[PDB]
Design a protein around this nucleic acid. Structure first.
Ligand SMILES: [Zn+2]
Ligand SMILES: [Zn+2]
Ligand SMILES: [Zn+2]
Lengths: 158, 1461, 69
DNA sequence: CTACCGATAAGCAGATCTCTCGATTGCGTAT
DNA sequence: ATACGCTCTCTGCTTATCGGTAG
RNA sequence: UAAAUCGAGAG
């Protein structure tokens, strides 16, 4: 996935002590893995929640975000680990982290959704939102640009 | 407003001033000390922002006046700021005054004599004696002579003032006009600039420290220099507190009171108040009443006011600094440690800066530091402020808004209102003796039964609501309507019934955007029973620009008789037949009625007696006042045998006969319609319309007859029978055509869009000839001979070269477009109407396209023949980098279709490539449509803001709001634009002589006129003008002025303009036709007397609208941007200046083509073929070889010979090259030519070496002039230089020959006969030399500022009119020269070239106008520092204070004639 | 949603001809035109009433709050 | 040689029709 | 559970500084 | 009862 690669590219961040030259203990803290659980509820054993509940409750259709830290000390001398929750992360319908992912149209009708319900949109506070696709420059291609504003970047600027 | 509550007082003028700290401490009811607004339990804490002494707050009685929240006006408090803080509004002028002051002697660094001179000049300008101000400067002839000079200057000023006051000119309060205001502003600017230019004081010559304002909230003064410190002995960085600045400026202002009395007062300071420097410091803030600081609430969400937050921050900082002051004060009695003093003083300084920043943030957000809360300034400045959002434009009561729907059976002056609006909207009718019949029934009917009543206003002001009442109670109340009052205090008053809107009420209908005044009319109300839409007649759609595509508009209900009469007489929709832009009509039947009348007035239209009579009664019902004779009079049938038949033209004839009033002749009109005689067969004359004696005898009634079109039947009826008759005729014709279409329907279908077999064959044969158009156009552009195959490698190479250039491909896309458009024109000429399967009038597509009902010829051409070339911003379809116009077209394909030529039609569809190109064109059209609306509003806003006060006065001259004269007579003839349509239609007026004589009626207009004097003067002037007027205009001595100058045209018959009189005489001479020329000339002169513009006309607003609204439809700059250059900016730096030069008939075109080459500039680069730089380092060497074109080439193209080029290189080019090289080094320190030379060349080389710096060789091709090689030595230490970009830059800027400010001359094709040279620069002085070729007396120029500079004011004004004229000539838009003349006269009223913007309006007597326009705070500061007093004369000024306008109905008063003394 | 009771243009009752139309199309291998003609729908105003009906109510009926699933 | 009069190169400001809906409204320590 | 500090302008004007005069 | 900002629309 992309979340793991991104959290890997984030890297590590360190900070030293104020007690003994040497600065103290490194504290190489970071995050190694991040996961999104399919949305669930506590009403004992967890039960699957479906977007019909999120729409009728006028609430969000959110799963659970679990980040596992790597609390390292002294350049890897001692490593502690913890799976910290990170609040309710909104999920969009008909995705691999949604409970309507591979449901047949019959099963979609059985769970009140639609005969041919399509996803691509999150539910936030009972309101359905989507994130618009943007047009941006093409990746990894150096394109020549003659732009007048470059001359405004300073004197002696073409 | 309540008409039964008169107000006895009136605000006449307002004046601006500083609110002194002493007065606010006295007016205040309480001061605030605790920056906590309300304590626990929600109660407002005493002494805080919400104090009961500042007003009633949330069901708490005000502690000041003892009144509850409804009746408490509110009271102002204050904040005792611990230190004086700078006023952010006045900070700039305070910083100006702080500099140029001498701390030692407490005077300005300028000498006292010059300061006294400026004071005397300003005092002279206070009384408008601008003449004497400059005569004061003519008094100049050690230490005692200056005192005598000052005494004599003061004596002269006093003598001038006393004489001017005694000589009936001025009163004690001075004369303040625009021009004297401009002179005062100029003098004060020169004064302030001169103060800033001093070295040391001229009364004690000691230097003073130089201040420096880093930003607001802090002023830093630099320390005096060592050398300057010495002078302070021989004559015997640092922060500065606010108190020190206050003390310095207080001392300076106390010393120089006599001089600042005339810098801070534009009028005689009668109060004699001293100008104090405390005015610039707000020692005490003023808190507004709590009524204006209330907290916002939404259910539970309660938020406090932002001004409260700012004031609380100020109070917190004040308490902090007060605590620091106390801490210092305790140590003042017993000092312990100076280090504690150090830290506490640093904290105190930080507190000073913090509280000053708090004040700045409270007043002006942009002056704060450290998105933020808006200040007081931010609440007034821009749109959404307080001037543009709550004073000039407000939200109103008794107004509805709804989506409109069409409705025939509405009288074309009426508005159909829904029952809901009829139930809600109400009018207060005072109960009278004649009214109780209807008002009693209205009260009984109640609020939910139209017509009804919703409220009763008793004499005392009680408002008894009828909503929650039963019928019996309503009868009890109705029986007590006209009961005489029991109270003496109200015995002069009667009750009012807030009755529902009725059928006799008027309503103001408006649809946004209101581009012109006709978009807001007055309609008579008719209430309909069914639906919730405002039903509107079709004729009103022309002015509102309204369709029925869900368009909505606003109905306003005037609530008094004064506004009733205006909407019924002035804003009346009958009065709005002709638009004031050009006098053309804007009312008439639009779409179905035009085709209906084309069918009905045809020759085939025969109607039996029943059909004829039913058609006549269907529109002329003689019980609604539709006819005059009380009995519908009919006509004998056209055909008597075999059975009686009438005709449609006879239907029109009897309609006119019934609507036209009796005791008056019928109309006589000879006109034309839009359908050619060839569309009716051979020998037809139905194209010419002929009304004779009120009977239609020939022609078809069309769009050009009824509709917004000039010189039709409806226009003639309006001119002859008046406006009400024309409106009635419009309504009757609408009903008639509606009833004819409901019995004889009109349809369009697929059969109308087809062509015959021969038509399709013609179209295919012509379009097959287009298979070679694109290739031939490309061959023409590429200069290949002809017949060259499309895949010719040279053709492809040159096509690729053409594509890469934006100019060559600009001519490729113009040449091919012309040929494909010619092919399109051939197709359209061949295939319509000949190739059509169905012919007019059966073909309804052509029937409604020819008649003007809807569509055009290009639309039916696209539908039936082809779409034609698709134009993208004047070019063809864009091209990719690869040279493909589309993926499906090979690169550089020489095809018309590839470039965007659609051969398909909407009948048979278009191919996907053609579909794509058409989508491009449609998208471009939509983008232009969206961007055009946004590009025109600002022009109209700028024009309306300044011209809103300009109006016609009772002197028949037009002048601004404050009285400044702009024109002496509207257009020079005082003729209304909306009443001069038929002034020169002399044959029309002759043919309808008796009809016009019935209305003008001289027999009743003789007791109140002078008839012979104006005629005699006109005869004298005409004789003299005929005797003269063969010589040039400057030679004509003006012995006799035109009659309009002397005799008032509205009071002396015969006093008319010279153009009208000359045209009348020419008409009366050319043709001689029981009407003789004497009676006809008398009738025409009376018509001219009645065609004059009324005093009080809002002429400036009308001119601004007539220049702005037509601007919606919109090598040299052309269009709206050109207007932006002229009106908005008054740019001396015109983007593309041009100059027109006449040509003597002696010169020939062979000389003309070469003369344009003897003036056009020639850069050195235009002849250089190439430049070769041979750099050999190890001193640096350079061989700057310049290879030219052949001598025969540039000696002919530019007429430049070898000698001139060589001299330019020797003198100009090398100097610039060396200068550039030295500059670059300075900024960076961080075939073989013959070697042998002759004798003279060596000496020339030596001279060139000597005159220049680092040249060691030089040579020029003195025999052929095709090369120039010279050396260039630099120091061996220097690093690498480009030495090619330097030469490229210099060569383009080196000049062979040029006339200054002129870059090119052209010889275009003569237009309108006269031969003209057009030049791309402006230099009159150089064209004055060429008398031989150019007629110097006729040099007119596009530049409207250079002509002002060299040819004075009036020539610039004429240029302004002509330039603002031809921008509308390109688009074929009719705007009268009367508007343009007024606009030009307003732009040049000061003798300069003023614009319509903030800088152009910088000088005006009305401060409110300039404040409301833009930059409110700067204008407010200028108005309050000058202590300006405005008389509330601008239209915008009276809105702020709420007074009746000075235009139209507010241009006079009304007096009652009480019979008993 | 459900078949209209009457044709809009003229008012002929066509709500009794929807199940019949479906049965005519289903059992008898008929085209739409012949099935409409057999039902007595002559004018095209009546023909497009049953020819173009979508019968969305069935899709509505599967969402039943009053019965368990 | 030095002080006044301009004469550009650079910096800075304000600015470029009405109407109808819905949705949100902040965090960061300190106690 | 809870209170108070915060990255593609048009027209000018206005400022700083550079040469020339003449004083 | 309020205000901005964002978003969506109508002429
Ligand atoms: Zn009060
Ligand atoms: Zn001094
Ligand atoms: Zn039917």
């Amino acid at each position: 996935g992309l979340l793991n690669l991104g959290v890997k590219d984030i890297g590590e961040k360190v900070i030293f002590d104020g007690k003994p030259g040497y600065l103290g203990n490194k504290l190489s803290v970071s995050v190694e893995q991040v996961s999104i659980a399919k949305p669930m509820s506590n009403d004992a054993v967890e039960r699957k929640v479906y977007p019909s509940e999120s729409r009728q409750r006028l609430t969000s259709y959110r799963g659970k975000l679990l980040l596992k830290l790597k609390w390292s000390v002294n350049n890897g001398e001692e490593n502690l680990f913890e799976v910290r929750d990170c609040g309710g992360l909104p999920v969009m319908l008909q995705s691999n982290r949604c409970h309507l992912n591979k449901m047949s149209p019959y099963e979609l009708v059985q769970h009140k959704e639609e005969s041919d319900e399509i996803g691509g949109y999150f539910i936030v506070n009972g309101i359905e939102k989507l994130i618009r696709m943007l047009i941006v420059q093409r990746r990894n291609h150096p394109m020549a640009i003659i732009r007048p504003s470059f001359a405004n970047r300073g004197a002696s600027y073409s | 407003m309540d008409i039964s509550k008169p107000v006895g007082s009136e605000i006449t003028s307002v004046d601006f001033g500083i609110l002194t700290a002493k007065e606010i401490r006295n007016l205040s009811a309480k001061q605030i000390t605790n920056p906590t607004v309300l304590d626990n339990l929600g109660h407002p804490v005493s002494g805080g922002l919400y104090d009961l002494a500042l007003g009633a707050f949330l069901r708490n009685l005000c502690s000041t006046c003892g009144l509850d929240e409804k009746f408490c006006p509110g009271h102002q408090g204050h904040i005792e700021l611990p230190v004086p803080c700078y006023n952010p509004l006045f900070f700039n002028q305070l910083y100006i005054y702080l500099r140029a002051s001498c701390l030692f002697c407490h005077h300005f660094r300028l000498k006292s004599v010059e300061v006294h001179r400026y004071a005397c000049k300003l005092r002279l300008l206070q009384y408008g004696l601008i003449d004497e101000s400059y005569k004061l400067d003519e008094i100049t002839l050690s230490s005692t002579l200056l005192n005598e000079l000052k005494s004599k200057r003061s004596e002269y000023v006093d003598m001038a003032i006393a004489k001017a006051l005694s000589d009936g000119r001025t009163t004690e309060r001075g004369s303040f006009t625009a021009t004297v205001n401009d002179e005062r502003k100029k003098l004060v600017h020169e004064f302030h600039k001169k103060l800033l230019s001093r070295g040391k004081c001229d009364n004690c010559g000691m230097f003073s420290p130089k201040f420096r304002k880093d930003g607001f909230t802090k002023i830093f003064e630099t320390a005096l220099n060592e050398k300057q410190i010495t002078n302070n002995r021989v004559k015997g960085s640092t922060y500065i507190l606010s108190t020190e600045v206050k003390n310095i400026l207080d001392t300076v202002f106390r010393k120089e009171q006599c001089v600042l009395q005339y810098v801070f007062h534009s009028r005689p300071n009668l109060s004699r108040k001293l100008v104090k420097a405390d005015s610039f410091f707000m020692d005490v803030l003023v808190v507004p009443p709590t009524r204006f600081r209330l907290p916002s609430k939404l259910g539970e969400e309660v938020h406090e006011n932002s001004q409260n937050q700012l004031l609380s921050k100020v109070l917190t900082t004040s308490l902090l600094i007060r605590d620091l002051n106390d801490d210092l004060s305790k140590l003042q009695k017993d000092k312990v440690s100076l280090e504690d003093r150090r830290v506490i003083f640093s904290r105190l300084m930080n507190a000073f800066v913090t509280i000053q920043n708090d004040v700045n943030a409270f007043i002006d957000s942009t002056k704060a530091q450290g998105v933020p809360i808006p200040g007081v300034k931010q609440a007034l400045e821009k749109k959404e402020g307080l001037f543009r959002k709550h004073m000039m434009g407000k939200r109103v009561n008794y107004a509805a808004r709804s989506v409109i729907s069409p409705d025939p059976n509405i009288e074309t002056n009426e508005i159909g209102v829904p029952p809901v609006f009829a139930v809600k909207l109400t009018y207060p009718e005072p109960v009278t003796a004649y009214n109780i019949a209807e008002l009693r029934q209205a009260v009984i009917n109640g609020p939910d039964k139209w017509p009804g009543a919703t409220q009763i206003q008793n004499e005392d002001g009680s408002l008894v609501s009828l909503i929650g009442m039963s019928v019996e109670q309503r009868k009890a109340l109705a029986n007590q309507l006209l009961t005489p009052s029991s109270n003496v205090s109200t015995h002069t008053l009667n009750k009012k019934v807030y009755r529902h809107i009725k059928n006799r009420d008027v309503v103001l209908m408006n649809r946004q955007p209101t581009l012109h005044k006709a978009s807001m009319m007055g309609h008579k109300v008719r209430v309909l029973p069914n639906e919730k839409t405002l039903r509107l007649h079709y004729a009103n759609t022309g002015a509102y620009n309204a369709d029925f595509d869900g368009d909505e508009m606003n109905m306003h209900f005037p609530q008094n008789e004064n506004a009733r009469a205006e909407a019924l007489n002035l804003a009346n929709t009958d009065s709005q037949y002709l638009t004031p832009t050009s006098g053309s009509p804007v009312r008439g039947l639009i779409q179905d009625h035009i085709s209906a009348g084309v069918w009905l007035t045809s020759k085939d239209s025969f109607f039996t007696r029943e059909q004829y009579q039913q058609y006549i009664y269907g529109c002329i019902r003689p019980e609604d006042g539709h006819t005059t004779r009380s009995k519908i009079v009919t006509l004998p049938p056209t055909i008597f045998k075999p059975y009686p038949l009438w005709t449609g033209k006879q239907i029109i004839t009897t309609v006119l006969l019934n609507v036209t009033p009796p005791d008056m002749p019928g109309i006589n009109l000879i006109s034309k319609n839009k359908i050619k005689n060839e569309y009716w067969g051979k020998g037809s004359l139905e194209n010419e319309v002929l009304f004779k004696d009120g009977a239609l005898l020939c022609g078809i009634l069309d769009k050009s007859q009824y509709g917004a079109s000039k010189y039709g039947i409806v226009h003639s009826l309006h001119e002859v029978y008046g406006p009400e008759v024309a409106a009635k005729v419009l309504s009757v014709l609408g009903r008639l055509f509606t009833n004819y279409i409901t019995a004889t329907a009109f349809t369009c279908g697929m059969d109308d869009l087809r062509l015959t077999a021969e038509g399709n064959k013609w179209r295919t044969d012509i379009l097959k000839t287009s298979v070679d158009t694109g290739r031939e156009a490309a061959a023409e552009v590429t200069n290949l001979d002809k017949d060259t195959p499309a895949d010719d490698p040279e053709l492809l190479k040159r096509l690729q070269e053409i594509l890469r250039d934006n100019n060559k491909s600009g001519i490729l896309d113009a040449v091919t477009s012309s040929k494909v458009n010619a092919i399109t024109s051939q197709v359209v000429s061949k295939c319509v109407p000949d190739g059509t399967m169905k012919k007019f009038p059966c073909n309804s597509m052509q029937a409604m396209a020819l008649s003007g009902a809807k569509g055009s010829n290009v639309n039916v051409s696209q539908i039936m023949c082809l779409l034609g070339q698709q134009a993208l911003e004047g070019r063809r379809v864009p091209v990719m980098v690869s040279g493909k116009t589309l993926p499906s077209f090979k690169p550089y394909e020489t095809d018309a279709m590839a470039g965007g030529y659609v051969k398909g039609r909407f009948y048979s569809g278009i191919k996907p490539q053609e579909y794509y190109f058409h989508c491009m064109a449609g998208r471009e059209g939509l983008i232009d449509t969206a961007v055009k609306t946004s590009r025109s509003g600002y022009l109209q806003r700028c024009l309306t803001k300044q011209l809103e006060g300009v109006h016609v006065s009772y002197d028949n001259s037009i002048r601004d709001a404050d009285g400044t004269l702009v024109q002496f007579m509207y257009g020079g003839d005082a003729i209304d634009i909306t009443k001069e349509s038929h002034m020169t239609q002399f044959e029309f007026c002759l043919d309808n002589y008796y009809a016009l004589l019935k209305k003008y009626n001289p027999s009743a207009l003789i007791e109140h006129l002078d008839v012979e004097s104006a005629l005699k003067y006109s005869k004298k002037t005409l004789k003299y003008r005929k005797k003269h007027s063969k010589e040039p205009h400057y030679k004509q001595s003006v012995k006799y002025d035109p009659v309009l100058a002397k005799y008032n045209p509205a009071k002396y018959l015969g006093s008319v303009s010279e153009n009208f009189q000359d045209k009348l005489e020419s008409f009366l001479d050319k043709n001689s036709k029981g009407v003789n020329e004497k009676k006809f000339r008398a009738l025409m002169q009376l018509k001219y007397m009645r065609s004059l513009i009324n005093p009080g006309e809002a002429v400036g607003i009308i001119a601004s609208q007539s220049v702005g609204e037509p601007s919606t439809q919109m090598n040299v700059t052309l269009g709206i941007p050109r207007l932006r250059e002229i009106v908005m900016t008054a740019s001396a730096a015109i983007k593309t200046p041009q100059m027109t030069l006449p040509i003597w008939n002696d010169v020939s075109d062979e000389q003309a083509d070469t003369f344009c080459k003897s003036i056009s500039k020639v850069l050195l680069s235009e002849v250089i073929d190439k430049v070769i730089v041979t750099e050999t380092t190890g001193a640096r060497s350079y061989v700057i070889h310049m290879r030219f074109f052949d001598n025969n080439e540039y000696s002919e193209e530019y007429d430049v010979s070898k000698e001139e080029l060589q001299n330019v290189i020797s003198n100009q080019f090398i100097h610039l090259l060396e200068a550039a090289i030295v500059k670059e080094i300075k900024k960076q320190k961080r075939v073989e030519a013959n070697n042998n030379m002759n004798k003279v060349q060596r000496d020339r080389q030596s001279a060139i070496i000597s005159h220049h710096r680092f040249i060691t060789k030089y040579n020029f091709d003195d025999e052929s002039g095709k090369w120039c090689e010279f050396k260039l030595e630099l120091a061996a230490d220097t690093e690498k230089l480009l030495m090619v970009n330097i030469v490229e830059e210099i060569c383009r800027k080196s000049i062979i020959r040029q006339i200054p400010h002129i870059d090119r001359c052209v010889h275009p094709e003569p237009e309108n006969g006269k031969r003209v040279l057009v030049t791309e620069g402006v230099n009159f002085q150089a064209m004055w030399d060429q008398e031989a070729f150019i007629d110097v007396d006729g040099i007119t120029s596009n530049d409207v500022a250079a002509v002002l500079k060299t040819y004075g004011v009036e020539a610039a004004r004429n240029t302004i009119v002509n330039e603002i004229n031809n921008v509308f000539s390109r688009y074929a838009i009719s705007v009268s020269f009367r508007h343009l003349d007024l606009i030009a006269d307003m732009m040049t009223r000061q003798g300069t070239y003023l614009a319509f913007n903030r800088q152009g309006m910088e000088t005006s007597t009305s401060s409110f106008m300039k404040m409301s326009y833009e930059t409110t705070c700067q204008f407010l500061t200028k108005a309050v520092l000058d202590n300006e007093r405005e008389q509330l004369d601008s239209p915008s000024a009276r809105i702020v204070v709420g007074k009746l306008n000075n235009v139209g109905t507010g241009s006079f008063d009304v007096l009652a004639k009480v019979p008993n003394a | 949603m459900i078949v209209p009771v009457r044709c809009f243009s003229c008012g002929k009752v066509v709500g009794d001809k929807w199940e019949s139309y479906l049965n005519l199309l289903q059992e008898d291998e008929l085209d739409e035109g012949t099935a409409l003609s057999r039902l007595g729908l002559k004018r095209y105003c009546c023909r497009r009433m049953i020819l173009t009906h979508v019968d969305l109510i069935e899709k509505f009926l599967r969402y039943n709050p009053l019965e368990k699933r």
